[PDB]
Amino acid sequence: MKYMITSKGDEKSDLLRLNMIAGFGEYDMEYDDVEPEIVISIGGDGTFLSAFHQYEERLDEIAFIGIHTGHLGFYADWRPAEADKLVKLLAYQKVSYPLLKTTVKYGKEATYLALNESTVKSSGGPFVVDVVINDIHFERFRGDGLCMSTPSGTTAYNKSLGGALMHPSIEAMQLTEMASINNRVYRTIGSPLVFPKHHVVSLQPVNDKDFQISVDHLSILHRDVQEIRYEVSAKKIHFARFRSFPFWRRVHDSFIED
Amino acid sequence: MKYMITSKGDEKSDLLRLNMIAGFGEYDMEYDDVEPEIVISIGGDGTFLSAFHQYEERLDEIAFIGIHTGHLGFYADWRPAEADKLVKLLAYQKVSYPLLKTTVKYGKEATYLALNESTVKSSGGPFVVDVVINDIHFERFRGDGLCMSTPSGTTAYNKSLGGALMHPSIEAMQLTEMASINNRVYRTIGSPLVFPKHHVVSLQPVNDKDFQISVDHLSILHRDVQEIRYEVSAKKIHFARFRSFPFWRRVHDSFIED
Amino acid sequence: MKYMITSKGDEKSDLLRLNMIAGFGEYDMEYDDVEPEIVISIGGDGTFLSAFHQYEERLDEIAFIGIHTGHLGFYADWRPAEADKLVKLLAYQKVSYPLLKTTVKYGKEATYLALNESTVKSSGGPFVVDVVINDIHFERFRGDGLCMSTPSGTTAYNKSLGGALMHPSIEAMQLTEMASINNRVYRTIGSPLVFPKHHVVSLQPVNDKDFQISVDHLSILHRDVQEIRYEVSAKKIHFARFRSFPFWRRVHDSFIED
Amino acid sequence: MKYMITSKGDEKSDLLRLNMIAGFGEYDMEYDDVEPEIVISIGGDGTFLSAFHQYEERLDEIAFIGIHTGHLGFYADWRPAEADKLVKLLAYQKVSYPLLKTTVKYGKEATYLALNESTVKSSGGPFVVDVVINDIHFERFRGDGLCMSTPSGTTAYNKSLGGALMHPSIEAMQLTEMASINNRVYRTIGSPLVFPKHHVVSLQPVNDKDFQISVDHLSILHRDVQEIRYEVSAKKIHFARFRSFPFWRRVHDSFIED
Ligand SMILES: C#CCOC[C@H]1O[C@@H](n2cnc3c(N)ncnc32)[C@H](O)[C@@H]1O
Ligand SMILES: C#CCOC[C@H]1O[C@@H](n2cnc3c(N)ncnc32)[C@H](O)[C@@H]1O
Ligand SMILES: C#CCOC[C@H]1O[C@@H](n2cnc3c(N)ncnc32)[C@H](O)[C@@H]1O
Ligand SMILES: C#CCOC[C@H]1O[C@@H](n2cnc3c(N)ncnc32)[C@H](O)[C@@H]1O
Ligand SMILES: C#CCOC[C@H]1O[C@@H](n2cnc3c(N)ncnc32)[C@H](O)[C@@H]1O
Ligand SMILES: C#CCOC[C@H]1O[C@@H](n2cnc3c(N)ncnc32)[C@H](O)[C@@H]1O
Ligand SMILES: C#CCOC[C@H]1O[C@@H](n2cnc3c(N)ncnc32)[C@H](O)[C@@H]1O
Ligand SMILES: C#CCOC[C@H]1O[C@@H](n2cnc3c(N)ncnc32)[C@H](O)[C@@H]1O
């Protein structure tokens, strides 16, 4: 089976990568980083996020596995000490999580896939956008910005913004406010909003049309924007699971105690 | 078709009820408040909640309609001025929202259905419970209490507790904290948690076993509790809709401006 | 010097109390629990709160010291192992913290002093009060209740309600909301409010006049209430300090890590 | 008496300015925008903030007045229709509000005065700083940034970040978090913190030393920062008041209803 390994690039992770490669060498396994069917990420969640984006064009052909040699490592299912057990075991059931499609339109159009979230802020200056849900104008948002999160993303930036944590079996996206202004004149919903598949949330500029748009902690300035459009993707990320590690246990281990 | 009308019981609502009855009298419609197939509620959300509980044993045989003569009236789809249009029109498509099943166990067992939410607080004294998700211990909660909300309930008590607003097509329940203690010694997740169908959240007492349990703003003291169990119900509430009034528009009208 | 010791009443605390008494026996110190000048509390913050209320009529004659044999123990300045050092040292500078005066009026009048906070909730049923600041109507509050905190109280219930932590050298009181309803019809400030000395906050009933009123975790049902009035007290609690233990370090130790 | 008028620069504000000048022409009043003793700002809060910074070197010689022709206008005490009454009346008691001193140090040093707040964010990349209160390390902050607010600033950016509203007679500054990360590994206080005069809060970089620093909505990139230091200023802003318009009424009018 074709596979590749990414590494955080520190000494621990590179050696672990070389060892697993040596170990895969004792089985019918081909190292191919062009068309892998298995992608192993060794490092933190940042490393895992990079792996996902490195291969976001072949998501339906790939199953991902994360090994943690980072700090928090929330998409990690394995400690390094378990690495040889993993090479053997891999020589399994697939689990799918929902993703977020962002469409950015100008005056052509670009689309992006997120595993955690997509956010919008201004290119400096006040941020003001009209929020339109399924063609119906919902609110005019004034403030720092907005965050649209996938279910697995809900434990990340979304969480820090007061969003709910959402089991990844729920096909949804969640919109949270960053520092909205609310007074006599200006009004937002305040609460996070959870949208199902097939709902489209569109942000439309009011004055300024330059925005800093992020997808999974890669941030780009987009100029001359006419619309930013959010929807649950039809595409999913697939994980190879070799044992039960339930989402809520993963949440417990990362936030309550481990 | 068999139908009945509940009323908030003020002058406006009683007269409106009598008028619709007179109007139904001109069609093939039988007033039956034992086995209605249509239940019309005239009043606020409190009136609607009472109607739902009056008939919670025949939910699959009934389609509800709310007319607002109350204050906020969030489950209302009609203004009173539109009442004659409604009797005629009713002489339609059905829409279903998810419900919450609460199981309370002692040392037998009682179950309750909620349209908005179920909450737990102590019978006076400190509230401390162990929160167990799918048999796995998740956290020990210290504080004022906990709230488990349906999707349509998310705009109610849940909202005031910092919960996310959740489109009612999502089959889920949402758990929010009321004033949790968080220090060096005590730790909760903080964030709201959204659970899918088939997940079971169980609250288990630590010391005290007396709790004040609410279902939709009816509150009862339960003694000698061993467990409180939450799960998305298999049962649904059915609304008769005669026109499009999308959930997010309903949210916009109630919170942003109407 | 006249002194007394209260104890949490577990074995650890009673023995520690007996030992300090024996130790004070070797100095010019008289045990007097009617007119102590020093009040030593051995236990948690609950024990300390009880000590304060036991002697709230002689606050200007007393200096308090807390020893922690409890759990969190936030008003504690000493670990038990340091107890003999304390008896000797005590054989010192005084530090004063602000207090909250609550006035409850009927149809006579009762006043209460709080070290942590005073809260108001309804006697069951919806809670609705008009909030009047310095005779000017500020808001109509709908929700679970309200909390008025002293500076030292800000790390307690206030904190769980989203209040700010306030250095106790600031002569102020802080009002926080418990689960306020906010929609098209109903509106509260949302934010905590910090009031200086000489500002009076008055809660006035709208319909129901029965309230559950708490002062430092002692809760009483008050009937036929016309007004609840809050103001920074002219009275202060005095601590004996034998070493520097700054408030922010105390906050750090209790919430960040110790 | 020497005076000057700033204007938002729209037609309404310029004409109003010219009219007041004409009106001052009928009294013993000299227009001097180098050494005014009275500074009238005609526009919104942005206009008022600019006026304050235009003259921040002569704050003890000046009394400010705001006229609102803007949108919200929170530092405004007058509607335009009242302008002639103001010129006459001005032909009064002074009110002082506290200010925030920010010190930025490199490897020399710059100081800034704020009327609303000072914030710190990173120059792109993760923001991580050590927060040191009075030389004692309090927390390591990971997240979007931090906001230090004056009392009058508490109704502004601070409010949107969950800060408490603070009566401006309280000599204090308030620190609020922007989107802090909190998990198994990383921990912040969460709550806003209110500091008295003479307390020093120092932010110290961990890795990156480039920060975007704002003072009252003027934002500058500072490079090679060793420390950012916050303290209640010894300087105050003075308002000329011609009538009672209490802070809490000002809050009520701006947030609850006017
Ligand atoms: C800014 C910054 C870095 O902080 C990001 C933190 O969130 C973590 N993280 C990334 N993705 C997720 C995620 N999906 N859930 C929870 N935590 C996450 C990441 O490991 C790191 O601890
Ligand atoms: C680095 C790293 C891990 O991935 C970056 C993740 O950091 C998360 N993040 C970024 N900024 C913040 C933030 N301020 N608080 C919490 N999480 C954050 C966000 O989810 C992003 O995908
Ligand atoms: C306590 C109390 C009364 O306040 C309840 C408020 O919430 C409203 N309410 C009830 N159910 C819902 C609901 N499901 N969504 C939004 N608002 C709701 C009710 O109409 C009233 O305005
Ligand atoms: C009366 C009425 C309408 O229904 C009562 C609803 O009030 C809501 N509720 C009760 N207490 C609060 C509260 N404190 N804040 C907001 N909503 C509340 C809750 O959802 C309950 O079902
Ligand atoms: C309900 C309940 C018991 O929880 C109260 C918690 O708050 C603690 N506590 C009491 N007073 C304060 C206080 N003033 N500051 C911080 N924590 C406090 C008390 O020790 C306990 O940990
Ligand atoms: C027991 C004990 C210590 O003192 C009780 C303190 O508990 C605090 N408290 C009560 N309920 C809560 C609560 N739900 N969350 C946090 N603190 C709370 C409150 O400050 C009260 O004075
Ligand atoms: C970003 C941006 C513009 O929004 C700033 C909003 O806050 C208002 N504002 C400025 N200063 C204050 C202030 N000190 N208090 C309340 N509101 C304020 C300003 O008028 C405007 O409505
Ligand atoms: C423009 C203008 C009025 O002054 C700018 C003020 O906007 C406030 N501000 C900036 N960003 C936000 C924001 N996101 N939310 C609320 N207030 C904000 C902040 O207090 C700043 O001083």
Coordinates of N, CA, C and O and ligand atoms in Angstrom, one line a residue, chain B residues 143-144 179 181, chain C residues 46 49 116-117 156-157 160 216-217, ligand 6:
Chain B
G143 N -21.4 23.9 40.5 CA -22.0 25.2 40.1 C -23.5 25.3 40.3 O -24.0 24.7 41.2
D144 N -24.2 26.1 39.5 CA -25.6 26.4 39.8 C -26.5 25.3 39.2 O -27.5 24.9 39.7
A179 N -23.2 28.9 35.6 CA -22.3 29.4 36.6 C -21.4 28.2 37.2 O -21.4 28.0 38.4
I181 N -18.1 26.6 38.7 CA -16.9 26.9 39.4 C -15.6 26.4 38.7 O -15.6 25.2 38.3
Chain C
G46 N -15.5 28.8 53.6 CA -16.8 28.7 54.3 C -16.7 28.9 55.8 O -17.5 29.6 56.4
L49 N -15.9 32.7 56.3 CA -17.2 33.4 56.1 C -18.0 33.3 57.4 O -18.6 34.3 57.8
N116 N -18.4 38.5 50.6 CA -18.3 38.0 49.3 C -19.3 38.7 48.4 O -19.0 39.5 47.5
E117 N -20.6 38.4 48.6 CA -21.6 39.0 47.7 C -23.0 38.8 48.3 O -23.2 38.1 49.3
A156 N -15.1 34.9 43.5 CA -16.0 33.9 43.9 C -17.2 33.8 42.9 O -16.9 33.6 41.7
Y157 N -18.4 33.8 43.4 CA -19.6 33.7 42.5 C -19.5 34.6 41.3 O -19.8 34.3 40.2
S160 N -17.6 33.3 38.3 CA -18.4 32.3 37.6 C -19.5 32.9 36.7 O -19.9 32.3 35.7
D216 N -23.4 35.9 51.3 CA -22.4 34.9 51.6 C -22.9 33.5 51.8 O -22.6 32.9 52.8
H217 N -23.7 33.0 50.8 CA -24.0 31.6 50.9 C -24.9 31.2 52.1 O -25.1 30.0 52.3
Ligands
LIG6 C1 -19.3 27.2 50.5 C2 -18.5 28.1 50.4 C3 -17.7 29.2 50.2 O1 -18.5 30.3 50.1 C4 -19.6 30.1 49.3 C5 -19.3 31.0 48.1 O2 -19.6 30.2 47.1 C6 -19.6 31.0 46.0 N1 -20.6 30.4 45.1 C7 -21.8 30.0 45.3 N2 -22.3 29.5 44.2 C8 -21.4 29.5 43.3 C9 -21.3 29.1 41.9 N3 -22.2 28.6 41.3 N4 -20.1 29.3 41.3 C10 -19.1 29.9 41.9 N5 -19.2 30.3 43.1 C11 -20.3 30.1 43.8 C12 -20.2 32.3 46.5 O3 -19.2 33.3 46.3 C13 -20.3 32.1 48.0 O4 -20.0 33.2 48.8

